[PDB]
Inverse folding.
C-alpha cells in the first residue's frame, strides 16, 4: 500500500 | 542511543506481552511483525516491498516498547521474513538519520 | 544532515552523471537501483525482502554521490520498486540512526 523495504542478500 | 550501521540495526521490542527482535527500518512506511495474536479488530491489507506484495492483518492503537522506548500506533501482522519497526513508530521514539 | 522520518527519507543521488531519487534504508544490507546501464562486468545475485526474492546484477567499484557525499562501492541493478541506499553505502557517508 504502504511499501516496506527490508532487504538481504542471497540464500 | 547512536546506532552505527556496520551491522543490522536490530533491537529488542515488547509487543502484546512478548519479547521480539526487530529491525529499525527507515525504508519501511509501516511496522510489520511475524505471526502473533493481537487484540482488537483488524482489516486485511496488501503491502509491497522489494519482491512483491504480502497480505497482512492491520491492528490499530497497539503499544510497542522499542529498546526501552514506548510508542503507540498501527501494527501489521503477516508473513514478513523479519520483524520491522518502520517510520510510523520510529517517529514516535524520536529517531533520526544523521550524517 | 539530520533527517526525521515523518516523510520517506528520499534523497538525490548521482550515478553515471545522472540524478536519481533514492530511499535511505537502514533495513537494507545492499544498495539496489532500478534498471540502468553501468560499466564493467557484473555477477549474479539474489536478494530477498518482504515479498520474496529478485534477481539482480552486481556491479563493483561504482562511483556514486549520495545527498552530496561521494562513495565508491557495490551497486545492485534490478527490478526494485524504488532505488534503495543500504548499509553498504550508508556506512561510507557516515550515517547513524539516533534516538
Amino acid at each position: 500500500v504502504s511499501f516496506n523495504x527490508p532487504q538481504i542478500t542471497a540464500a | 542511543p547512536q546506532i552505527t550501521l556496520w551491522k543490522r540495526p536490530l533491537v529488542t521490542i515488547k509487543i502484546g506481552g512478548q519479547l521480539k527482535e526487530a529491525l529499525l527500518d527507515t525504508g519501511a512506511d509501516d511496522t510489520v511483525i511475524e505471526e502473533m495474536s493481537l487484540p482488537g479488530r483488524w482489516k486485511p491489507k496488501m503491502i509491497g516491498g522489494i519482491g512483491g506484495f504480502i497480505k497482512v492483518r492491520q491492528y490499530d492503537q497497539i503499544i510497542i516498547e522499542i529498546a526501552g522506548h514506548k510508542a503507540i500506533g498501527t501494527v501489521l501482522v503477516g508473513p514478513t521474513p523479519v520483524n520491522i519497526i518502520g517510520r510510523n513508530l520510529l517517529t514516535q521514539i524520536g529517531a533520526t538519520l544523521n550524517f
About this structure: The radius of gyration of chain B is 13 Å. Chain B has one domain: 1-99. The longest helix of chain B spans residues 87-90. Chain B has one helix and nine strands.
